[PDB]
Protein backbone atom coordinates (compact mmCIF):
# COMPACT_ATOMS: atom_id res chain seq x y z
CA UNK A 1 0.00 0.00 0.00
CA UNK A 2 3.13 2.17 0.01
CA UNK A 3 4.04 1.44 -3.62
CA UNK A 4 1.70 2.89 -6.24
CA UNK A 5 0.51 0.56 -8.99
CA UNK A 6 -1.27 3.16 -11.07
CA UNK A 7 -4.11 5.58 -11.42
CA UNK A 8 -7.59 5.63 -12.86
CA UNK A 9 -9.14 8.84 -14.14
CA UNK A 10 -12.88 9.29 -14.63
CA UNK A 11 -13.91 12.10 -16.95
CA UNK A 12 -16.90 13.80 -18.41
CA UNK A 13 -15.75 14.71 -21.94
CA UNK A 14 -17.51 16.67 -24.68
CA UNK A 15 -16.77 15.29 -28.15
CA UNK A 16 -18.64 16.38 -31.26
CA UNK A 17 -20.81 18.43 -28.90
CA UNK A 18 -22.12 15.37 -27.06
CA UNK A 19 -21.19 14.40 -23.51
CA UNK A 20 -19.51 11.07 -22.76
CA UNK A 21 -18.12 9.34 -19.69
CA UNK A 22 -14.55 8.08 -20.14
CA UNK A 23 -12.30 6.14 -17.78
CA UNK A 24 -8.56 5.90 -18.33
CA UNK A 25 -5.98 3.75 -16.56
CA UNK A 26 -2.42 5.00 -16.18
CA UNK A 27 0.29 2.62 -15.06
CA UNK A 28 2.57 4.25 -12.52
CA UNK A 29 5.91 2.78 -13.58
CA UNK A 30 5.53 2.90 -17.34
CA UNK A 31 3.00 5.78 -17.58
CA UNK A 32 1.19 3.64 -20.13
CA UNK A 33 -2.45 4.60 -20.61
CA UNK A 34 -5.49 2.61 -21.65
CA UNK A 35 -9.07 3.60 -22.39
CA UNK A 36 -11.33 1.50 -20.18
CA UNK A 37 -14.72 3.05 -20.85
CA UNK A 38 -16.22 5.56 -23.28
CA UNK A 39 -20.00 5.66 -23.27
CA UNK A 40 -22.80 8.05 -23.90
CA UNK A 41 -24.24 10.41 -24.58
CA UNK A 42 -24.77 10.94 -20.82
CA UNK A 43 -26.61 13.65 -18.91
CA UNK A 44 -24.42 16.49 -17.63
CA UNK A 45 -23.51 16.19 -13.96
CA UNK A 46 -25.44 18.18 -11.44
CA UNK A 47 -23.76 20.94 -9.52
CA UNK A 48 -24.02 18.72 -6.43
CA UNK A 49 -22.48 15.43 -5.39
CA UNK A 50 -23.41 12.15 -6.98
CA UNK A 51 -25.06 9.53 -4.77
CA UNK A 52 -23.17 6.25 -4.42
CA UNK A 53 -23.21 3.34 -2.02
CA UNK A 54 -21.71 -0.07 -1.49
CA UNK A 55 -24.29 -2.83 -1.89
CA UNK A 56 -24.19 -6.47 -0.83
CA UNK A 57 -23.07 -9.32 -3.10
CA UNK A 58 -26.24 -11.40 -2.96
CA UNK A 59 -28.11 -12.94 -5.91
CA UNK A 60 -29.01 -9.61 -7.56
CA UNK A 61 -25.35 -8.62 -7.63
CA UNK A 62 -24.20 -12.06 -8.79
CA UNK A 63 -26.69 -11.69 -11.65
CA UNK A 64 -25.14 -8.35 -12.67
CA UNK A 65 -21.84 -10.22 -12.92
CA UNK A 66 -23.43 -12.89 -15.10
CA UNK A 67 -24.83 -10.13 -17.30
CA UNK A 68 -21.44 -8.49 -17.57
CA UNK A 69 -19.75 -11.74 -18.63
CA UNK A 70 -22.50 -12.56 -21.11
CA UNK A 71 -22.14 -9.12 -22.67
CA UNK A 72 -18.35 -9.31 -22.71
CA UNK A 73 -18.54 -12.66 -24.48
CA UNK A 74 -20.47 -10.91 -27.28
CA UNK A 75 -17.50 -8.53 -27.64
CA UNK A 76 -14.73 -11.12 -27.42
CA UNK A 77 -11.91 -8.90 -26.21
CA UNK A 78 -10.96 -11.61 -23.70
CA UNK A 79 -12.03 -14.73 -25.55
CA UNK A 80 -14.83 -16.90 -24.19
CA UNK A 81 -15.16 -16.29 -20.45
CA UNK A 82 -16.93 -18.37 -17.79
CA UNK A 83 -18.59 -16.41 -15.01
CA UNK A 84 -17.35 -17.36 -11.54
CA UNK A 85 -18.59 -14.81 -9.01
CA UNK A 86 -18.80 -11.17 -8.02
CA UNK A 87 -16.71 -10.16 -4.99
CA UNK A 88 -16.85 -7.21 -2.62
CA UNK A 89 -16.88 -4.24 -2.94
CA UNK A 90 -19.78 -3.61 -5.33
CA UNK A 91 -20.87 -0.01 -5.82
CA UNK A 92 -24.23 1.39 -6.94
CA UNK A 93 -24.58 4.96 -8.21
CA UNK A 94 -28.02 6.54 -8.61
CA UNK A 95 -28.33 9.03 -11.48
CA UNK A 96 -31.22 11.45 -10.98
CA UNK A 97 -33.14 13.34 -13.63
CA UNK A 98 -32.04 16.97 -14.03
CA UNK B 1 -33.28 15.33 -8.62
CA UNK B 2 -36.48 13.71 -7.35
CA UNK B 3 -37.00 11.53 -10.44
CA UNK B 4 -34.47 8.73 -10.93
CA UNK B 5 -32.91 8.38 -14.36
CA UNK B 6 -31.04 5.16 -13.70
CA UNK B 7 -28.30 3.37 -11.90
CA UNK B 8 -24.69 2.44 -12.49
CA UNK B 9 -23.16 -0.62 -10.87
CA UNK B 10 -19.42 -1.12 -10.50
CA UNK B 11 -18.29 -4.69 -9.93
CA UNK B 12 -15.24 -6.79 -9.39
CA UNK B 13 -16.07 -10.03 -11.24
CA UNK B 14 -14.13 -13.29 -11.50
CA UNK B 15 -14.46 -14.90 -14.92
CA UNK B 16 -12.34 -17.83 -16.05
CA UNK B 17 -10.50 -17.42 -12.74
CA UNK B 18 -9.25 -13.93 -13.59
CA UNK B 19 -10.49 -10.72 -11.98
CA UNK B 20 -12.09 -7.97 -14.07
CA UNK B 21 -13.71 -4.62 -13.38
CA UNK B 22 -17.15 -4.23 -14.96
CA UNK B 23 -19.54 -1.28 -14.99
CA UNK B 24 -23.20 -1.68 -15.92
CA UNK B 25 -25.84 0.96 -16.54
CA UNK B 26 -29.47 0.23 -15.73
CA UNK B 27 -32.18 2.55 -16.96
CA UNK B 28 -34.77 3.20 -14.28
CA UNK B 29 -37.92 3.28 -16.40
CA UNK B 30 -37.17 0.48 -18.83
CA UNK B 31 -34.75 -1.56 -16.65
CA UNK B 32 -32.60 -1.87 -19.76
CA UNK B 33 -28.98 -2.72 -19.01
CA UNK B 34 -25.77 -1.98 -20.87
CA UNK B 35 -22.18 -3.04 -20.30
CA UNK B 36 -20.06 0.10 -20.10
CA UNK B 37 -16.70 -1.30 -19.08
CA UNK B 38 -15.07 -4.72 -18.75
CA UNK B 39 -11.32 -4.62 -18.30
CA UNK B 40 -8.57 -6.59 -16.71
CA UNK B 41 -7.17 -8.64 -15.31
CA UNK B 42 -7.05 -6.24 -12.32
CA UNK B 43 -5.52 -6.63 -8.86
CA UNK B 44 -7.96 -7.74 -6.15
CA UNK B 45 -9.21 -4.90 -3.97
CA UNK B 46 -7.63 -4.34 -0.62
CA UNK B 47 -9.61 -4.91 2.52
CA UNK B 48 -9.57 -1.13 3.03
CA UNK B 49 -11.06 1.81 1.19
CA UNK B 50 -9.83 2.94 -2.18
CA UNK B 51 -8.30 6.41 -2.42
CA UNK B 52 -10.07 8.83 -4.76
CA UNK B 53 -10.15 12.57 -5.24
CA UNK B 54 -11.54 15.23 -7.52
CA UNK B 55 -8.82 16.94 -9.54
CA UNK B 56 -8.87 20.20 -11.48
CA UNK B 57 -9.63 20.45 -15.20
CA UNK B 58 -6.41 22.11 -16.30
CA UNK B 59 -4.19 21.10 -19.24
CA UNK B 60 -3.27 17.65 -17.85
CA UNK B 61 -6.95 16.77 -17.55
CA UNK B 62 -7.82 18.23 -20.94
CA UNK B 63 -5.07 16.00 -22.37
CA UNK B 64 -6.66 12.91 -20.79
CA UNK B 65 -9.84 13.87 -22.65
CA UNK B 66 -7.93 14.17 -25.91
CA UNK B 67 -6.43 10.75 -25.26
CA UNK B 68 -9.85 9.28 -24.59
CA UNK B 69 -11.28 10.66 -27.84
CA UNK B 70 -8.26 9.53 -29.85
CA UNK B 71 -8.61 6.02 -28.43
CA UNK B 72 -12.37 5.97 -28.98
CA UNK B 73 -11.85 6.98 -32.59
CA UNK B 74 -9.73 3.82 -33.03
CA UNK B 75 -12.76 1.81 -31.84
CA UNK B 76 -15.41 3.62 -33.85
CA UNK B 77 -18.44 2.86 -31.69
CA UNK B 78 -19.51 6.51 -32.06
CA UNK B 79 -18.13 7.34 -35.48
CA UNK B 80 -15.39 9.93 -35.85
CA UNK B 81 -15.46 12.25 -32.85
CA UNK B 82 -13.88 15.69 -32.38
CA UNK B 83 -12.59 16.44 -28.90
CA UNK B 84 -14.12 19.56 -27.36
CA UNK B 85 -13.26 19.71 -23.66
CA UNK B 86 -13.31 17.95 -20.32
CA UNK B 87 -15.73 19.37 -17.74
CA UNK B 88 -15.96 19.08 -13.96
CA UNK B 89 -16.02 16.81 -12.02
CA UNK B 90 -12.93 14.77 -12.89
CA UNK B 91 -11.95 12.00 -10.50
CA UNK B 92 -8.56 10.37 -9.90
CA UNK B 93 -8.23 7.02 -8.13
CA UNK B 94 -4.85 5.80 -6.91
CA UNK B 95 -4.36 2.02 -7.02
CA UNK B 96 -1.64 0.85 -4.63
CA UNK B 97 0.45 -2.29 -4.86
CA UNK B 98 -0.76 -5.11 -2.59
Coordinates of N, CA and C in Angstrom, one line a residue, chain A residues 1-26 29 33-41 43-46 48-49 51-52 55 60-61 63-69 71-72 75 77-78 80-98, chain B residues 1-26 29 33-41 43-46 48-49 51-52 55 60-61 63-69 71-72 75 77-78 80-98:
Chain A
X1 N 0.8 -1.2 0.0 CA 0.0 0.0 0.0 C 0.9 1.3 0.0
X2 N 2.2 1.1 0.2 CA 3.1 2.2 0.0 C 3.5 2.4 -1.5
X3 N 3.7 1.3 -2.2 CA 4.0 1.4 -3.6 C 2.8 1.6 -4.5
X4 N 2.8 2.6 -5.4 CA 1.7 2.9 -6.2 C 1.8 1.9 -7.4
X5 N 0.6 1.4 -7.8 CA 0.5 0.6 -9.0 C 0.1 1.4 -10.2
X6 N -0.9 2.3 -10.0 CA -1.3 3.2 -11.1 C -2.4 4.0 -10.6
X7 N -3.0 4.7 -11.6 CA -4.1 5.6 -11.4 C -5.2 5.2 -12.4
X8 N -6.4 5.7 -12.0 CA -7.6 5.6 -12.9 C -8.2 7.0 -12.8
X9 N -8.5 7.5 -14.0 CA -9.1 8.8 -14.1 C -10.5 8.7 -14.7
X10 N -11.5 9.3 -14.2 CA -12.9 9.3 -14.6 C -13.3 10.7 -15.0
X11 N -13.7 10.8 -16.3 CA -13.9 12.1 -16.9 C -15.3 12.2 -17.5
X12 N -15.8 13.4 -17.5 CA -16.9 13.8 -18.4 C -16.2 14.6 -19.6
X13 N -16.4 14.1 -20.8 CA -15.7 14.7 -21.9 C -16.8 15.0 -23.0
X14 N -16.7 16.3 -23.5 CA -17.5 16.7 -24.7 C -16.7 16.3 -25.9
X15 N -17.3 15.6 -26.8 CA -16.8 15.3 -28.2 C -17.9 15.4 -29.2
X16 N -17.6 16.1 -30.3 CA -18.6 16.4 -31.3 C -19.9 16.9 -30.6
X17 N -19.7 17.7 -29.6 CA -20.8 18.4 -28.9 C -21.7 17.5 -28.1
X18 N -21.4 16.3 -27.9 CA -22.1 15.4 -27.1 C -21.3 15.0 -25.9
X19 N -21.9 14.7 -24.7 CA -21.2 14.4 -23.5 C -21.1 12.9 -23.3
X20 N -19.8 12.5 -23.0 CA -19.5 11.1 -22.8 C -18.8 10.9 -21.4
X21 N -18.9 9.7 -20.8 CA -18.1 9.3 -19.7 C -17.0 8.5 -20.2
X22 N -15.7 8.8 -19.8 CA -14.6 8.1 -20.1 C -13.7 7.8 -18.9
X23 N -13.2 6.6 -18.9 CA -12.3 6.1 -17.8 C -11.0 5.7 -18.4
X24 N -9.9 6.2 -17.8 CA -8.6 5.9 -18.3 C -7.7 5.3 -17.2
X25 N -7.0 4.3 -17.5 CA -6.0 3.7 -16.6 C -4.6 4.3 -17.0
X26 N -3.8 4.5 -16.0 CA -2.4 5.0 -16.2 C -1.5 4.2 -15.3
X29 N 4.5 2.9 -13.3 CA 5.9 2.8 -13.6 C 6.2 3.1 -15.0
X33 N -1.1 4.3 -20.8 CA -2.5 4.6 -20.6 C -3.3 3.7 -21.5
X34 N -4.5 3.4 -20.9 CA -5.5 2.6 -21.6 C -6.9 3.2 -21.4
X35 N -7.7 3.2 -22.5 CA -9.1 3.6 -22.4 C -9.9 2.4 -21.9
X36 N -10.6 2.6 -20.8 CA -11.3 1.5 -20.2 C -12.8 1.6 -20.4
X37 N -13.3 2.8 -20.7 CA -14.7 3.1 -20.9 C -14.9 4.3 -21.7
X38 N -15.9 4.3 -22.6 CA -16.2 5.6 -23.3 C -17.7 5.3 -23.7
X39 N -18.6 5.9 -23.0 CA -20.0 5.7 -23.3 C -20.8 7.0 -23.2
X40 N -21.9 7.0 -23.9 CA -22.8 8.0 -23.9 C -23.7 8.1 -25.1
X41 N -24.3 9.2 -25.4 CA -24.2 10.4 -24.6 C -24.8 10.2 -23.2
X43 N -26.2 12.4 -19.4 CA -26.6 13.7 -18.9 C -25.5 14.4 -18.2
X44 N -25.5 15.7 -18.3 CA -24.4 16.5 -17.6 C -24.5 16.3 -16.1
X45 N -23.4 16.3 -15.4 CA -23.5 16.2 -14.0 C -24.2 17.4 -13.3
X46 N -24.9 17.1 -12.2 CA -25.4 18.2 -11.4 C -24.4 18.9 -10.7
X48 N -24.2 19.3 -7.7 CA -24.0 18.7 -6.4 C -23.4 17.3 -6.6
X49 N -23.2 16.7 -5.4 CA -22.5 15.4 -5.4 C -23.4 14.3 -5.8
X51 N -24.6 10.4 -5.9 CA -25.1 9.5 -4.8 C -24.6 8.1 -5.1
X52 N -23.8 7.5 -4.2 CA -23.2 6.3 -4.4 C -23.1 5.5 -3.1
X55 N -23.2 -1.9 -2.0 CA -24.3 -2.8 -1.9 C -23.7 -4.2 -1.7
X60 N -28.9 -10.7 -6.6 CA -29.0 -9.6 -7.6 C -27.7 -9.2 -8.1
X61 N -26.7 -9.0 -7.2 CA -25.3 -8.6 -7.6 C -24.6 -9.7 -8.4
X63 N -26.0 -11.7 -10.3 CA -26.7 -11.7 -11.7 C -26.2 -10.6 -12.5
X64 N -25.8 -9.4 -11.9 CA -25.1 -8.4 -12.7 C -23.8 -8.9 -13.2
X65 N -23.1 -9.7 -12.4 CA -21.8 -10.2 -12.9 C -22.1 -11.2 -14.1
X66 N -23.1 -12.0 -14.0 CA -23.4 -12.9 -15.1 C -23.8 -12.1 -16.4
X67 N -24.5 -11.0 -16.2 CA -24.8 -10.1 -17.3 C -23.6 -9.6 -17.9
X68 N -22.7 -9.1 -17.1 CA -21.4 -8.5 -17.6 C -20.6 -9.5 -18.4
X69 N -20.5 -10.7 -17.9 CA -19.8 -11.7 -18.6 C -20.5 -12.1 -19.9
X71 N -22.3 -10.2 -21.7 CA -22.1 -9.1 -22.7 C -20.7 -9.0 -23.2
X72 N -19.7 -9.3 -22.3 CA -18.3 -9.3 -22.7 C -18.1 -10.5 -23.7
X75 N -18.6 -9.4 -27.1 CA -17.5 -8.5 -27.6 C -16.2 -9.3 -28.0
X77 N -13.2 -9.4 -26.5 CA -11.9 -8.9 -26.2 C -11.1 -9.9 -25.4
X78 N -11.7 -10.7 -24.6 CA -11.0 -11.6 -23.7 C -11.3 -13.1 -24.0
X80 N -13.6 -16.4 -24.8 CA -14.8 -16.9 -24.2 C -14.6 -17.0 -22.7
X81 N -15.3 -16.3 -21.9 CA -15.2 -16.3 -20.5 C -16.3 -17.1 -19.8
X82 N -16.0 -17.7 -18.6 CA -16.9 -18.4 -17.8 C -17.1 -17.6 -16.5
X83 N -18.3 -17.2 -16.2 CA -18.6 -16.4 -15.0 C -18.3 -17.3 -13.8
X84 N -17.6 -16.7 -12.8 CA -17.4 -17.4 -11.5 C -18.2 -16.7 -10.4
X85 N -17.9 -15.5 -10.1 CA -18.6 -14.8 -9.0 C -18.2 -13.3 -9.0
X86 N -19.1 -12.6 -8.3 CA -18.8 -11.2 -8.0 C -18.3 -11.1 -6.6
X87 N -17.3 -10.3 -6.3 CA -16.7 -10.2 -5.0 C -17.0 -8.7 -4.5
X88 N -16.8 -8.5 -3.2 CA -16.8 -7.2 -2.6 C -15.6 -6.4 -3.0
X89 N -15.7 -5.1 -3.1 CA -16.9 -4.2 -2.9 C -17.6 -4.0 -4.3
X90 N -18.9 -4.0 -4.2 CA -19.8 -3.6 -5.3 C -20.4 -2.2 -5.0
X91 N -20.4 -1.4 -6.0 CA -20.9 0.0 -5.8 C -22.1 0.2 -6.7
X92 N -23.0 1.0 -6.2 CA -24.2 1.4 -6.9 C -24.3 2.9 -6.9
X93 N -24.4 3.5 -8.1 CA -24.6 5.0 -8.2 C -26.0 5.2 -8.7
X94 N -26.7 6.2 -8.1 CA -28.0 6.5 -8.6 C -27.9 7.8 -9.4
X95 N -28.3 7.8 -10.6 CA -28.3 9.0 -11.5 C -29.7 9.6 -11.5
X96 N -29.9 10.8 -11.0 CA -31.2 11.4 -11.0 C -31.5 12.3 -12.2
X97 N -32.8 12.5 -12.5 CA -33.1 13.3 -13.6 C -32.8 14.8 -13.2
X98 N -32.3 15.5 -14.2 CA -32.0 17.0 -14.0 C -32.9 17.6 -12.9
Chain B
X1 N -34.1 16.1 -9.6 CA -33.3 15.3 -8.6 C -34.2 14.4 -7.8
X2 N -35.5 14.6 -7.9 CA -36.5 13.7 -7.3 C -36.7 12.5 -8.2
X3 N -36.8 12.6 -9.5 CA -37.0 11.5 -10.4 C -35.7 10.8 -10.8
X4 N -35.7 9.5 -10.6 CA -34.5 8.7 -10.9 C -34.4 8.5 -12.4
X5 N -33.2 8.7 -13.0 CA -32.9 8.4 -14.4 C -32.4 7.0 -14.5
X6 N -31.5 6.5 -13.6 CA -31.0 5.2 -13.7 C -30.0 4.9 -12.7
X7 N -29.3 3.8 -12.8 CA -28.3 3.4 -11.9 C -27.1 2.9 -12.7
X8 N -25.9 3.0 -12.0 CA -24.7 2.4 -12.5 C -24.1 1.6 -11.4
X9 N -23.7 0.3 -11.8 CA -23.2 -0.6 -10.9 C -21.7 -0.9 -11.3
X10 N -20.8 -0.9 -10.3 CA -19.4 -1.1 -10.5 C -19.0 -2.4 -9.7
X11 N -18.5 -3.3 -10.4 CA -18.3 -4.7 -9.9 C -16.8 -5.1 -10.1
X12 N -16.4 -5.9 -9.2 CA -15.2 -6.8 -9.4 C -15.8 -8.2 -9.7
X13 N -15.5 -8.8 -10.8 CA -16.1 -10.0 -11.2 C -15.0 -11.0 -11.6
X14 N -15.0 -12.2 -11.1 CA -14.1 -13.3 -11.5 C -14.8 -14.0 -12.7
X15 N -14.0 -14.1 -13.8 CA -14.5 -14.9 -14.9 C -13.3 -15.7 -15.4
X16 N -13.4 -17.0 -15.7 CA -12.3 -17.8 -16.1 C -11.2 -17.7 -15.1
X17 N -11.5 -17.5 -13.8 CA -10.5 -17.4 -12.7 C -9.6 -16.2 -12.8
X18 N -10.0 -15.2 -13.6 CA -9.3 -13.9 -13.6 C -10.2 -12.8 -13.1
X19 N -9.7 -11.8 -12.5 CA -10.5 -10.7 -12.0 C -10.6 -9.5 -13.0
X20 N -11.8 -9.1 -13.2 CA -12.1 -8.0 -14.1 C -12.9 -6.9 -13.3
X21 N -12.8 -5.7 -13.8 CA -13.7 -4.6 -13.4 C -14.8 -4.5 -14.5
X22 N -16.0 -4.4 -14.0 CA -17.2 -4.2 -15.0 C -18.1 -3.2 -14.4
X23 N -18.6 -2.3 -15.3 CA -19.5 -1.3 -15.0 C -20.8 -1.5 -15.8
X24 N -21.9 -1.4 -15.2 CA -23.2 -1.7 -15.9 C -24.1 -0.5 -15.7
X25 N -24.8 0.0 -16.7 CA -25.8 1.0 -16.5 C -27.2 0.2 -16.5
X26 N -28.1 0.8 -15.8 CA -29.5 0.2 -15.7 C -30.4 1.4 -15.8
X29 N -36.5 3.5 -15.9 CA -37.9 3.3 -16.4 C -38.1 2.0 -17.2
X33 N -30.3 -2.7 -19.5 CA -29.0 -2.7 -19.0 C -28.0 -2.7 -20.2
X34 N -26.9 -2.0 -19.9 CA -25.8 -2.0 -20.9 C -24.4 -2.2 -20.1
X35 N -23.5 -2.9 -20.8 CA -22.2 -3.0 -20.3 C -21.4 -1.8 -20.7
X36 N -20.8 -1.1 -19.8 CA -20.1 0.1 -20.1 C -18.6 -0.1 -20.0
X37 N -18.1 -1.1 -19.3 CA -16.7 -1.3 -19.1 C -16.5 -2.8 -18.7
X38 N -15.4 -3.4 -19.2 CA -15.1 -4.7 -18.7 C -13.6 -4.8 -19.1
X39 N -12.8 -4.7 -18.1 CA -11.3 -4.6 -18.3 C -10.6 -5.4 -17.2
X40 N -9.4 -5.9 -17.6 CA -8.6 -6.6 -16.7 C -7.6 -7.4 -17.4
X41 N -7.0 -8.4 -16.7 CA -7.2 -8.6 -15.3 C -6.7 -7.5 -14.4
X43 N -5.9 -6.1 -10.2 CA -5.5 -6.6 -8.9 C -6.8 -6.7 -8.0
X44 N -6.8 -7.7 -7.1 CA -8.0 -7.7 -6.1 C -8.0 -6.5 -5.2
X45 N -9.1 -6.1 -4.8 CA -9.2 -4.9 -4.0 C -8.6 -5.2 -2.6
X46 N -8.1 -4.2 -2.0 CA -7.6 -4.3 -0.6 C -8.8 -4.3 0.3
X48 N -9.3 -2.5 2.6 CA -9.6 -1.1 3.0 C -10.1 -0.3 1.9
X49 N -10.4 1.0 2.2 CA -11.1 1.8 1.2 C -10.1 2.3 0.1
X51 N -8.6 5.0 -2.6 CA -8.3 6.4 -2.4 C -8.7 7.2 -3.7
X52 N -9.5 8.1 -3.6 CA -10.1 8.8 -4.8 C -10.2 10.3 -4.4
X55 N -10.0 16.2 -9.1 CA -8.8 16.9 -9.5 C -9.3 18.0 -10.5
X60 N -3.5 19.1 -18.0 CA -3.3 17.7 -17.9 C -4.6 16.9 -18.1
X61 N -5.6 17.4 -17.4 CA -6.9 16.8 -17.5 C -7.5 16.9 -18.9
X63 N -5.8 16.9 -21.6 CA -5.1 16.0 -22.4 C -5.6 14.6 -22.2
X64 N -6.0 14.2 -21.0 CA -6.7 12.9 -20.8 C -7.9 12.8 -21.7
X65 N -8.7 13.9 -21.8 CA -9.8 13.9 -22.6 C -9.5 13.7 -24.1
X66 N -8.4 14.4 -24.6 CA -7.9 14.2 -25.9 C -7.5 12.7 -26.1
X67 N -6.8 12.1 -25.2 CA -6.4 10.7 -25.3 C -7.7 9.9 -25.4
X68 N -8.7 10.1 -24.6 CA -9.8 9.3 -24.6 C -10.5 9.3 -26.0
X69 N -10.7 10.5 -26.5 CA -11.3 10.7 -27.8 C -10.4 10.0 -28.9
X71 N -8.5 7.5 -28.6 CA -8.6 6.0 -28.4 C -10.0 5.6 -28.9
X72 N -11.0 6.3 -28.6 CA -12.4 6.0 -29.0 C -12.5 6.0 -30.5
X75 N -11.7 2.8 -32.0 CA -12.8 1.8 -31.8 C -13.9 2.0 -32.8
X77 N -17.1 3.1 -32.1 CA -18.4 2.9 -31.7 C -19.3 4.1 -32.0
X78 N -18.8 5.3 -31.9 CA -19.5 6.5 -32.1 C -19.1 7.3 -33.3
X80 N -16.6 9.1 -36.0 CA -15.4 9.9 -35.9 C -15.8 11.1 -35.0
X81 N -15.2 11.2 -33.8 CA -15.5 12.3 -32.8 C -14.4 13.3 -32.9
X82 N -14.8 14.6 -32.5 CA -13.9 15.7 -32.4 C -13.9 16.1 -30.9
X83 N -12.7 16.1 -30.3 CA -12.6 16.4 -28.9 C -13.0 17.9 -28.7
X84 N -13.8 18.2 -27.7 CA -14.1 19.6 -27.4 C -13.5 20.0 -26.1
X85 N -13.8 19.3 -24.9 CA -13.3 19.7 -23.7 C -13.7 18.7 -22.6
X86 N -12.9 18.7 -21.5 CA -13.3 17.9 -20.3 C -13.9 18.9 -19.4
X87 N -15.0 18.5 -18.7 CA -15.7 19.4 -17.7 C -15.6 18.8 -16.3
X88 N -15.9 19.6 -15.3 CA -16.0 19.1 -14.0 C -17.2 18.2 -13.8
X89 N -17.2 17.2 -12.8 CA -16.0 16.8 -12.0 C -15.2 15.7 -12.7
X90 N -13.9 15.8 -12.5 CA -12.9 14.8 -12.9 C -12.4 14.1 -11.6
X91 N -12.4 12.8 -11.6 CA -12.0 12.0 -10.5 C -10.7 11.2 -10.8
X92 N -9.8 11.2 -9.8 CA -8.6 10.4 -9.9 C -8.6 9.4 -8.8
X93 N -8.4 8.1 -9.1 CA -8.2 7.0 -8.1 C -6.8 6.5 -8.2
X94 N -6.2 6.3 -7.0 CA -4.9 5.8 -6.9 C -5.0 4.3 -6.5
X95 N -4.4 3.4 -7.3 CA -4.4 2.0 -7.0 C -3.0 1.7 -6.5
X96 N -2.9 1.2 -5.3 CA -1.6 0.9 -4.6 C -1.3 -0.6 -4.8
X97 N 0.0 -0.9 -4.8 CA 0.5 -2.3 -4.9 C 0.0 -3.0 -3.6
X98 N -0.4 -4.2 -3.7 CA -0.8 -5.1 -2.6 C -0.1 -4.7 -1.3

